[PDB]
Symmetry: C3
Subunit: 348 residues, 3 copies
């Protein structure tokens, strides 16, 4: 017998004061369209120009927000002439061979001088080519290492603008429920008179007059409130000898000695009769349970970042460049010939 | 005495026509799950393959959406032989030294020819190594400067899909309120009979019959509307000699000469009595104010992009590459020897 | 004459059991603020350090969630001496010219040896410079090709956190409607007594007692339910000889032979009178239609990715680097002079 038969002091209106309410409801929302450049980047031109490559995403967000003795002296004469004539013929061999040698040395040394001027013109091409191609690799890699940091901050400002768009759609879906509240609260109280307590102004409803506002409706409700009220002890129902008895359109207001079915909204007692009450059987309480679970969503739970990275990420490190190490590739006779050019006159 | 005692013409139902309403409410939403590849990238394979590195974000969005004389001639003979014998010994010095010199020149010139063929084989290695390593730097930097632009557009299409997911969750949270409206509107009008005006069909409620639809409930409401109605002047309350008097379950319908408490929803006058009215004291109006602020959120206001960039951004520019500038490193005797090889025969 | 005059079996409460409901409503939501590092990246330090360059986006999401014979022998003596004296003067020419030649060869060969040591010191500079500058291009391009893949996965986890923030704002905008339901359901049933069926506990309302919970209100409603009920055939209205007749605060309960206006919520018949019914004219049904379109949004439809890419995307491919191809730039007299240095003694 838990609560259905407990008696507790309940305020019941003793008397009334006449009153009026001004109740304001928003029924529409002005279309807060957003320029996506000025929101995310603002004045800053390098990120602005990057925004064009994010596509027409801005428009897409605005679809949402815009909706919603003479012999031996002579034989010595033969001898010395035969020694000389044979010597000079050996001088011509000695000298012709030296000319044929020194003329092959002067050939090959000038062919080497040609080869080194060929090498310098080709290597001037290589250090000039590498100058231009490697300056471009440096100049463009500096651009790409800048842009990847500005894209980072654009992408975190995208989420700030997506929180803006979500909170601006959330509010517009509350506004469209407040326009349904303005529909029922117009109907039941401008076309009718409500029997509900505090719907259509504080207290109990008499009459109403709607007036517009720029995005709203405002109600003038004329109502009566309890100027004074008294706590009577009560029960919702009473179980006499195993039968439960309970009101019809009232409560059991409790006098010191008797039960009366007062109207809930006023102290005006009337006697228990089979026309003021309903009746039951066996004196039992049915117990009901209601649990209004507003929806608790499947929230997007994720692995640790290491697992969702390592699934596809490649930690490729290019090797330390090594190339060819070219540091590993490592007068006396003219004095005499000048001396004997003089000292041969000592044998003239 | 603002509005509680003003009298204005109010329509009160003179007569009724019987009527029926068909009222359609959606109570459920079919689960519009989204393939995230086909939404963002579609057929285009380069961005598709990029989508795998954005992780299982697609699934995460689908958790949401799937929920929700013889002596001097002889001394001259001694003389000339002594001059010749001494000259030939000086020829052997002159010639042996020239051989030892020209043999050091032919050594060093071929050691130079060896050094230059060593240099060309090592430099062929360097321009071959730099050919491969610098072609890879070019070929991969072209890939990374392409991918960073395709990632840009994927990331702006992510926001278009996040606006899709937000507007699809927003609608499902309206659907779950329309399923609460279908619960109260089933209960009060299929199990009951409502006293509210225009809830459960236009006019005043008699009876109802629910029927299903694929994701909805449809109500047949049987109701009566005012076929005809008349404007009576009225007041919600009247203050006689400083006491306010007001109805009990009606309005003061105003006849040319008398006040009657008509039932709000019908013209049927009854006389003012202490059983048709309540009474007050001192003739004052209580004024109440209600302002239904649907929530205006803390929207995500940000610095200018320059401040949120400059906090972490580094404007590092790599220097213009300069390297070594190798352009800054800058027969008559054989004719005679051929001539005297001939002209020495003139002294044979 | 579609449904307003059809008769069908309707359950009308025959008798009552007293009952109580416990009804739980959440009225507030605890502020589930999110650390954005730990959500997206977790422990993993390389992506954590990247999060700082996405800006204060985390805060921005938390603004949302924290809200919400002697002569001829002598003439031969003159002859041979004149041949010798003339020969030696031609030896001095032959030898002085060879010295002046071999001294220009030893000059130019050592000037070549100087030029090649100049070249090796300058090229050691170039392969040392390119070693450092090209190692940095390799080492930094490896960093940028890593970061662009970790940013990809951060940006797909951003959407998972934006689905988290959207579903956490969606639920908080249901909570604020359940706090409006707790306001009307407190007012009409703790301050009043509702005439609605199943609002404020199963069945019909007597009385209520609210109790708090940590983020909620719980109502004890005391109510009566139909212990027993009987199906009477009924009609909402009847059209006698072309006039429609319908109840006042009841239904036409159908007895085997007569119509009675029973109270909708109880079987207690009363006779048709002009005080139990309203009356009409011409016997016609008005048909109304209501279609509660919960808002179907302008969803963000996009081009195929190829069109939104090709609008701005540049498919720039850098050319295959070609540079200078340096592979296209391509003793007997000393034996004799050693032999005649010996064999000239055969003419001494
Ligand atoms: C009305 O519906 C509400 C849901 O819409 C219910 O709220 C739920 O209440 C339960 C129990 O209090 C709660 O379960 C978890 O609560 C803790 C918060 O996560 C969690 O730590 C608990 O886990 C502990 O207890 C279990 C069970 O013994 C153990 O197995 C665990 O090892 C651990 O010790 C528990 O799992 C729900 O989270 C909560 N949901 C919501 C949405 O609030 C109301 O209880 C319900 N009221 C009535 C009267 O039915
Ligand atoms: C019911 O509640 C509503 C809020 O839920 C109130 O709406 C608010 O109304 C005020 C005043 O009209 C408004 O304040 C600002 O309005 C302008 C829009 O931003 C703004 O420019 C104003 O600033 C100007 O005025 C102030 C004050 O003199 C000066 O200091 C400024 O320098 C400037 O000149 C003002 O700050 C709110 O924005 C608005 N809020 C919303 C959510 O609409 C209703 O007024 C209220 N109604 C009643 C009858 O109480
Ligand atoms: C209450 O309002 C609802 C909207 O709030 C209405 O629902 C709408 O119903 C219509 C018709 O059933 C539907 O139109 C399209 O339905 C199909 C789904 O996209 C689509 O394939 C259809 O296209 C076909 O038919 C047209 C017309 O013949 C042809 O031109 C086409 O070539 C094709 O063959 C059709 O365009 C709406 O989508 C739907 N909207 C929603 C939000 O559900 C209810 O019908 C309405 N009820 C009453 C009783 O008025
Ligand atoms: C991808 O390659 C990265 C190198 O390019 C690598 O980073 C390296 O990680 C190891 C192990 O964590 C570190 O080794 C040392 O780490 C700390 C730092 O002092 C020491 O206390 C430890 O004792 C250990 O010796 C390297 O220092 C670190 N190198 C760099 C440049 O960061 C990543 O771990 C690799 N990731 C994957 C998934 O393979
Ligand atoms: C980061 O470094 C950028 C250079 O790589 C630098 O851009 C340079 O900005 C200056 C000042 O705005 C510009 O200087 C000239 O700008 C206009 C352009 O004609 C002139 O009218 C001015 O009188 C001025 O002389 C440079 O032209 C510009 N260079 C480039 C290549 O864009 C950024 O400003 C630097 N940013 C930060 C935050 O340090
Ligand atoms: C941007 O440049 C890309 C090259 O860097 C280019 O990719 C190339 O596309 C063509 C045409 O689709 C492919 O050609 C062959 O494609 C398949 C592959 O076997 C064959 O069956 C076909 O018959 C055809 O011969 C190239 O293979 C492909 N190259 C690479 C490296 O992917 C893009 O198409 C260019 N995009 C734009 C928009 O210009
Ligand atoms: C009976 O009604 C009176 C008011 O008419 C209640 O008095 C209030 O009680 C609360 C709770 O102790 C106090 O905080 C207020 O200051 C009291 N106001 C006055 C004017 O006395 C009283 O609590 C009610 N009795 C019961 C049992 O609810
Ligand atoms: C060898 O001696 C002769 C003398 O017989 C030199 O001939 C003279 O050379 C000088 C120049 O050095 C001239 O001015 C004279 O006119 C030359 N004299 C005659 C007679 O012709 C010859 O120069 C000497 N050679 C060497 C290498 O000492
Ligand atoms: C009394 O009721 C009549 C309708 O029965 C109202 O007449 C309408 O008044 C509006 C406002 O001027 C006009 O736009 C309509 O065309 C009128 N309809 C007809 C049929 O006349 C009249 O306004 C009501 N009087 C008051 C004071 O509200
Ligand atoms: C010097 O004169 C002699 C003659 O005494 C030349 O010897 C002749 O050389 C030719 C070839 O040029 C041969 O055909 C003859 O058979 C040789 N004659 C004899 C007798 O041997 C010699 O060639 C001359 N040298 C120069 C350099 O003119
Ligand atoms: C009259 O009321 C009774 C219950 O008092 C209804 O009986 C139920 O009918 C449904 C539909 O066939 C069955 O699934 C249940 O098993 C029945 N319950 C019992 C206890 O019999 C009956 O359907 C009602 N008649 C009409 C026309 O609605
Ligand atoms: C040419 O013959 C002379 C002899 O008249 C050689 O002179 C001798 O040389 C040897 C060394 O080879 C010395 O040991 C002797 O003392 C030298 N003798 C004299 C008398 O001085 C000369 O060496 C020979 N030259 C060649 C090239 O065979
Ligand atoms: C074979 C050769 O020439 N080796 C030289 C060595 O003699 C010299 O001392 C050194 C100094 O750099 O360079 C190398
Ligand atoms: C020392 C030397 O050889 N300098 C030369 C110069 O004589 C020549 O005129 C110039 C032409 O390129 O090249 C350099
Ligand atoms: C003009 C010249 O020297 N050309 C040479 C050729 O004789 C040699 O056969 C070839 C071998 O690599 O190299 C080149
Ligand atoms: C209800 O109140 C009366 C007096 O007002 C008292 O006699 C009675 O015992 C109360 N009910 C219960 C169950 O105590
Ligand atoms: C309450 O109403 C009665 C009924 O007229 C009246 O007699 C009494 O004086 C009123 N109370 C006050 C405090 O005015
Ligand atoms: C109310 O209407 C009556 C006539 O219908 C009029 O005499 C009376 O003055 C009106 N009330 C006011 C406050 O003017
Ligand atoms: C309105 O109802 C009354 C009551 O029967 C009737 O006499 C009158 O003719 C009705 N008015 C019209 C226009 O039918
Ligand atoms: C309504 O029910 C009665 C008997 O309960 C029957 O005579 C009458 O024909 C029914 N109405 C219609 C339109 O059939
Ligand atoms: C229903 O109520 C009546 C009225 O007192 C009673 O006579 C009848 O026995 C009750 N039915 C049951 C099954 O108790």
């Amino acid at each position: 017998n838990s609560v259905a038969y407990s008696n507790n002091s309940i305020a019941i209106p003793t008397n009334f004061t006449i009153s009026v309410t001004t109740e304001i409801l928003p029924v529409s929302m002005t279309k807060t369209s957003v320029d996506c450049t000025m929101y995310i980047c603002g004045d800053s031109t390098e990120c602005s120009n990057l925004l064009l490559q994010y596509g027409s995403f801005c428009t897409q967000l605005n679809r949402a927000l815009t909706g919603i003795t003479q012999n031996v002296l002579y034989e010595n004469q033969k001898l010395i002439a035969n020694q000389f004539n044979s010597a000079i013929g050996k001088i011509q061999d000695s000298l012709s061979s030296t000319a044929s040698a020194l003329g092959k040395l002067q050939d090959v040394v000038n062919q080497n001088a040609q080869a080194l001027n060929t090498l310098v013109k080709q290597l001037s091409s290589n250090f000039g080519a590498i100058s231009s191609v490697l300056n471009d690799i440096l100049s463009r890699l500096d651009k790409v290492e800048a842009e990847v940091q500005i894209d980072r901050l654009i992408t975190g400002r995208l989420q700030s603008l997506q929180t803006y768009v979500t909170q601006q759609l959330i509010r517009a879906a509350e506004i469209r429920a407040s326009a349904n509240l303005a529909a029922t609260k117009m109907s039941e109280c401008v076309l009718g008179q409500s029997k509900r307590v505090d719907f259509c102004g504080k207290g109990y409803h008499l009459m109403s007059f709607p007036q517009s506002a720029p995005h709203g409706v405002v109600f003038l409700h004329v109502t009566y409130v309890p100027a004074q009220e008294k706590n009577f002890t009560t029960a919702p129902a009473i179980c006499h000898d195993g039968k439960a008895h309970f009101p019809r359109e009232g409560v059991f207001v409790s006098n010191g000695t008797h039960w009366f079915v007062t109207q809930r909204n006023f102290y005006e007692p009337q006697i228990i009769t089979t026309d003021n009450t309903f009746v039951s059987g066996n004196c039992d309480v049915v117990i009901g349970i209601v649990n209004n679970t507003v929806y608790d969503p499947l929230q997007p739970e994720l692995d640790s970042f290491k697992e969702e990275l390592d699934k596809y990420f490649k930690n490729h490190t290019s090797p330390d460049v090594d190339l060819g190490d070219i540091s590993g590739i490592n007068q006396k006779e003219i004095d005499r010939l000048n001396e004997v050019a003089k000292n041969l006159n000592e044998s003239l």
